[PDB]
């Protein structure tokens, strides 16, 4: 009552993972992404992966 | 002039190499130099090599990436994520950017090879990659833009202010190297068994040959180390 028109606008936000986002496992290991490290600097196995 | 007794290699030897995998050797090396050369080359290979990927996509009748094309099982988001996976190898020299208009109809599956009949300057290296499943009566008219870049450029940076309406920018993973693995084995030269032998295993996407990738990484390393003259 008292409203002649109802206007709605939906906005979709695609949010990538970034520093400060909260990640957690299924065992209570919550945490905050501190650094997005280049794949060249990240530890690699004997197979180069 | 004191560099007399440092045993330096003569060449780099290619054991086995395809357009996608290559195995290389580097010997003889002074102790500790194998790790230096291998790690520098691995970092430059996984970091700075150029490549080709898609920057913009426009599907007819689709205004935003959160919509659906009639008759297509996959939404526009999944189509975009699949389009991100297409790999290109340059066929015509000096071609840095190309606009491809794609019109596919009468098929039950849109594969990356269907883009090849419309692409002139680039070659699709994985034509078996499925973009989307459609009905036999679905006509798909899409426009993709292929550009040259390095590393990773997010879709936010790829957004052009003069792009036509309905153009959807996409994330671009330009890197051509999938994996670099190196090993260091001892090598015996005459009486000394302490010399080192370097083994290189490079997996590429096919856009750049492993030997060419090694050469370009070495070129970057030389360009960086000349500045200390």
DSSP chain B: --TTS------EEEEEE-SSEEEEEEEEE-TTHHHHHHHHHHHHHHHH-EEEEEEEEEETT--STT---TTBSS-HHHHHHHHTT--EEE-STT--EEEEEEEEES-SEEEGGGGTTT-SSEEES-TT-EEEEB-TT-EEEEEEEEEEEESEE-TTTT--TTPPTT-EE--EE---EEEEEEEEEEEEETTEEEEEEEEEEEEE-SSS-HHHHHHHHHHHHHHHHGGG-
Residue of A nearest to B46 (CA): A40
Strand partners, B103: B141
Would you call B65 an interface residue with chain A, using a CB distance cutoff of 8 Å? yes
DSSP state of B117: T
Tokens of A46: 């004997």
Total residue count of chain A as it appears in this document:
49
Residue of B nearest to A11 (CA): B66
Would you call B180 an interface residue with chain A, using a CB distance cutoff of 8 Å? yes
**Is there a contact between B47 and B151 (Cβ–Cβ < 8 Å)?**
yes
**Which of A48, A17, A21 is closest to A32 using CA atoms?**
A21
Q: Which residue has the tokens 């090694």?
A: B214
Positive or negative CA dihedral for A30, A18, B147, B169?
A: positive
- State how far the Cα of B175 lies from the Cα of B52, in Å rounded to an integer: 8
Tokens of B108: 């039950």
Distance from CA of B92 to the nearest CA of A (A): 31
**Which of B29, B36, B24, B23 is closest to B10 using CA atoms?**
B29
- State how far the Cα of B198 lies from the Cα of B208, in Å rounded to an integer: 22
Do A38 and B47 make contact, defined as CB atoms within 8 angstroms?
yes
Q: For residue B61, give Cα distances in angstroms to A41, B77, B130, B139, B170.
A: 43, 15, 21, 11, 18
- State how far the Cα of B47 lies from the Cα of B89, in Å rounded to an integer: 19
Numbers of helices and strands, H then E, in chain B: 3, 14
Distance from CA of A1 to the nearest CA of B (A): 34
Residue of B nearest to A41 (CA): B43
**Straight-line distance from the first to the last Cα atom of chain B, in angstroms, rounded to the nearest whole number:** 16
Of B47, B64, B180, nearest to A48 by CB-CB distance is B180
Q: For residue B158, give Cα distances in angstroms to A13, B37, B54, B123, B131.
A: 17, 35, 10, 22, 21
Residues of B in contact with A40 (CB under 8 A): 42-43, 46-47
Total residue count of chain B as it appears in this document:
229
């Amino acid at each position: 009552a008292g409203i002649m028109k109802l206007a709605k606008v939906y906005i979709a936000k695609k949010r990538k993972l970034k520093v400060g986002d909260k990640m957690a496992g299924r065992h209570g290991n919550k945490g905050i992404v501190a650094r997005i490290v280049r794949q060249e600097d990240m530890p690699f196995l004997e197979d180069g992966t | 002039m004191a560099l007399l007794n440092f045993q330096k290699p003569d060449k780099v030897i290619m054991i086995d190499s395809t357009d996608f995998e290559g195995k290389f050797e580097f010997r003889p090396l002074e102790p500790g130099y194998g790790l230096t050369v291998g790690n520098a080359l691995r970092r430059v290979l996984l970091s700075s090599l150029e490549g080709f990927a898609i920057t913009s996509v426009r599907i007819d009748g689709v205004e935003h990436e959160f919509s659906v094309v009639p008759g297509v099982v996959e939404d526009v988001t999944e189509i975009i994520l699949n389009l991100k996976q297409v790999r290109f190898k340059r066929q015509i020299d000096d071609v840095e950017s190309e606009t491809v208009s794609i019109s596919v109809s009468g098929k039950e599956q849109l594969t990356a090879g269907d883009f090849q009949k419309f692409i002139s300057g680039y070659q699709v290296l994985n034509p078996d990659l499925v973009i989307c499943n459609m009905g036999p009566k679905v006509s798909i008219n899409m426009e993709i833009v292929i550009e040259k870049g390095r590393g990773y450029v997010p879709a936010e940076e790829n957004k052009k202010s003069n792009a036509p309406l309905g153009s959807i920018a996409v994330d671009s993973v330009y890197t051509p190297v999938k994996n670099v693995k190196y090993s260091i084995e001892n090598y015996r030269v005459e009486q000394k068994t302490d010399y080192e032998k370097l083994v290189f295993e490079i997996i590429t996407d096919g856009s750049i040959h492993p030997k060419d990738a090694l050469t370009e990484a070495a070129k970057v390393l030389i360009h960086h180390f000349m500045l200390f003259s």
